[PDB]
């Protein structure tokens, strides 16, 4: 019964190990770096057609097909170049807050306030998009069942857990436990061997997909972490929270490097994404604006223009050419 | 594969989206909230790991889609953002259990002061009034044990034209209604209105009480959109 203070003794060994390596700051090393400049971006396409609030988008790996979910109970697959509607999938649940596109391109996933991740088959011989699996077994809602490895999915929320379903069998292979609050966002690494995960207990946790262990945890924020996104080399990640701040952690130093905050901003971050190079940190906010942050200088390089409601989803395409922003005004917009 | 035949597909999809906009704008969404002691499942059954239950019912050619939530965690500050742009919230309280009636007040206060539910009206269904009368006619358990300000409460002038009952049933049930409207006024603006009702176990008028109160919420959505306020 001596465990409650030996745990706090361990958590001071971690803070003494993290402060022994903080010899400098990311603001000090990048003081002699030339700034990026004012980034004017223009709305190139505006994809209309959703009847209700858009909650999630995801690009394809071809950098041309978007999928988008909305609260009417429909997924729409868009052609980004020609503003075309490829598919219109009517869902069984109206309440869906995650969507996915498989990196092969054959599958889309969706999940929501029903506790199921629904995998859909796009390359069906019969010509219609049929549901392939209804992955049930996750007590509580599904926030980011939205990342496929290749034919195994990773799911995140509700029971404060993350899972590693096998789509062929329809059962859980690894349950990731260790978050106290509801788990809001996950980001897979480029190598698909690690994934970082953010919850409403103000902590982000690295997990190993093969072993099933939480090998690191990051406790820097002050409120619920709503969005998470890996750096393009998988050594860093970014978290946006309800405290109007974005923070850049590092996996090899195991601490927080830079905080992206402004005194004008008082609204929480709903969506974070990086550029292809890692210099830009695009963040969507509770008000109707997206900000472009320099990830090396903590400076607002620019601002994406207006939606009429809350910017809810944001994703930079795999070629790095476009930035797609979807909001609660039923409109997706493709930026450049 | 000619690109002109892909625009004919994209125009045929939009014709299906516009004839699904007609059944989306015409239907009225609702949200049931309440604890387990509140007779919430009885209201669903008297109308005509699954994380959401849906119930459709028509009252005079108007479709209502209730969304009884279940199989969720205790904290609800994250999925309540999903139920912005709903027509109402049907909050059901058990009136009998006065020990758990105070946590129904702090639960109602968290809804009414929510950042994402600032424009949404609440239709309170004060439930099990057949069980509250027996707990004040028998007089064993009494409300002023838990609230210090019941003895300084008297029934107002215009109150409850009942067919016949006790005046302490009317005095108590107007006190339970009084704290709920007190949160509806002091911690809120004139953007959304609470609508208190009194409901028994078997009651075939709950579908009419929702229709009459949702005829009123749409009337104040129109009086502000047409700027007639």
């Amino acid at each position: 019964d001596q465990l409650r203070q030996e745990a706090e003794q361990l958590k001071n060994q971690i803070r003494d190990a993290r402060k022994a390596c903080a010899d400098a700051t990311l603001s000090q090393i990048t003081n002699n770096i030339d700034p990026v400049g004012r980034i004017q971006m223009r709305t190139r396409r505006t994809l209309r057609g959703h009847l209700a609030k858009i909650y999630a988008m995801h690009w394809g790996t071809d950098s041309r097909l978007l999928v988008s979910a909305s609260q009417d109970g429909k997924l729409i697959i868009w052609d980004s170049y020609t503003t075309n509607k490829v598919h219109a999938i009517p869902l069984r649940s109206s309440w869906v807050m995650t969507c996915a596109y498989a990196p092969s391109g054959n599958y889309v996933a969706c999940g929501g306030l029903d506790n199921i991740c629904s995998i859909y088959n796009l390359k069906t011989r019969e010509g219609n998009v049929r549901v392939s699996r209804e992955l049930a077994g996750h007590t509580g809602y599904l926030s980011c069942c939205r990342f496929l490895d290749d034919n195994q999915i990773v799911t995140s929320s509700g029971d404060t857990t993350c899972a590693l379903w096998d789509i062929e069998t329809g059962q859980q292979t690894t349950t990731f436990t260790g978050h106290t609050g509801d788990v809001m966002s996950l980001s897979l690494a480029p190598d698909t061997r690690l994934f970082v995960s953010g919850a409403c207990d103000a902590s982000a946790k690295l997990w190993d997909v093969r072993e099933g262990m939480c090998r690191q945890t990051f406790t820097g924020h002050e409120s619920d972490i709503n969005a998470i996104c890996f750096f393009p080399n998988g050594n860093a990640f970014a978290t946006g929270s309800d405290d109007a701040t974005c923070r850049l952690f590092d996996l090899r130093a195991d601490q927080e490097l830079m905080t992206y905050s402004h005194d004008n901003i008082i609204c929480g971050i709903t969506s974070v994404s990086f550029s292809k190079s890692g210099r830009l940190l695009l963040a969507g906010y509770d008000d109707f604006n997206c900000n472009v942050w320099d990830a090396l200088k903590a400076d607002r390089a620019g601002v994406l223009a207006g939606h009429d409601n809350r910017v809810s989803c944001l994703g930079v395409t795999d070629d790095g050419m476009a930035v797609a922003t979807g909001s609660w005004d039923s409109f997706l917009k493709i930026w450049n | 594969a000619e690109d002109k035949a892909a625009v004919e597909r994209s125009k045929m999809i939009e014709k299906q989206l516009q004839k699904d906009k007609q059944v989306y704008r015409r239907t009225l969404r609702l949200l049931l909230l309440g604890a387990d002691n509140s007779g919430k499942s009885t209201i669903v059954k008297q109308m005509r790991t699954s994380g959401i239950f849906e119930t459709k019912f028509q009252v005079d050619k108007v479709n209502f889609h209730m969304f009884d939530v279940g199989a969720q965690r205790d904290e609800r500050r994250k999925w309540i953002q999903c139920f912005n742009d709903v027509t109402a919230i049907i909050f059901v309280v058990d009136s009998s259990d006065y020990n758990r009636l105070q946590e129904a007040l702090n639960d109602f206060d968290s809804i009414w002061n929510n950042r994402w539910l600032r424009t949404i009206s609440v239709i309170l269904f004060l439930n099990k009034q057949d069980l509250l009368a027996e707990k004040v006619l028998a007089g064993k358990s009494k409300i002023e044990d838990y609230f210090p300000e019941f003895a300084r409460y008297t029934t107002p002038e215009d109150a409850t034209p009942e067919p016949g009952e006790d005046p302490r049933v009317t005095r108590a049930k107007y006190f339970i209604r009084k704290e709920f409207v007190d949160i509806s006024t002091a911690s809120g603006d004139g953007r959304h209105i609470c609508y208190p009702h009194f409901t028994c176990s078997v009651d075939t008028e709950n579908a009419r009480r929702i229709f009459n109160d949702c005829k009123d919420i749409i009337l104040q959505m129109n009086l502000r959109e047409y700027n007639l306020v």
């Epitope: 490829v86 598919h87 | 594969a1 000619e2 690109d3 035949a5 004919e8 045929m12």
Partner: single-chain antibody, 230 residues
Amino acid sequence: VQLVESGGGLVQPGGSRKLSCSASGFAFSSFGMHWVRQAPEKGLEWVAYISSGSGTIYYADTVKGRFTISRDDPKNTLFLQMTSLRSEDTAMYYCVRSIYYYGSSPFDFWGQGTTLTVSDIVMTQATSSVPVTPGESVSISCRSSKSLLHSNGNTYLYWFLQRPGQSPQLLIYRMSNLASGVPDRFSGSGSGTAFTLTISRLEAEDVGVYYCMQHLEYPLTFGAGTKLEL
């Protein structure tokens, strides 16, 4: 997936005959439908077309004004009403489906065919008969009048194969893309006017008549057909 064609038979010229095509096992209303005729010991020829929703109906010039194509999506059937039959209408009329979105595979499934016997970009195959023993590399070339490279980057060229006593099946649909159910022996390259279908190792089911088809301009003109015999 199945497309059974009905109607057909012997018609004295000057009369009329309606054809039918009962679809089963796919979503018929989301597929465009074509008709492709095949005269005895000749090549293929495109006849008519009706799109999904019956909004676009396009005909060839040899059947325009005389042939009428319709569909009935609740009964999942496809019609071709021919009015004054000439003796150039003695053919086998196939009922090929096609879907049109980004990444689709049109002309993917064909029907059995009906034998009716009545009593533009020109695509030419460079050869007509190549006898090759099983196990060698075969190249089947074709050329076009106009370049098939549109401004969007695509090269609208569709390779086929008709085995003896069968319906044609699609092999390569946009000059480079293999179909579903086709092995990696079949490979296709091209440059805009010159096109080449290469078979790496040859089997016994690889014999038949190989066709090529453009999809830029809508009177879809085929090739003459290259026959591999063994």
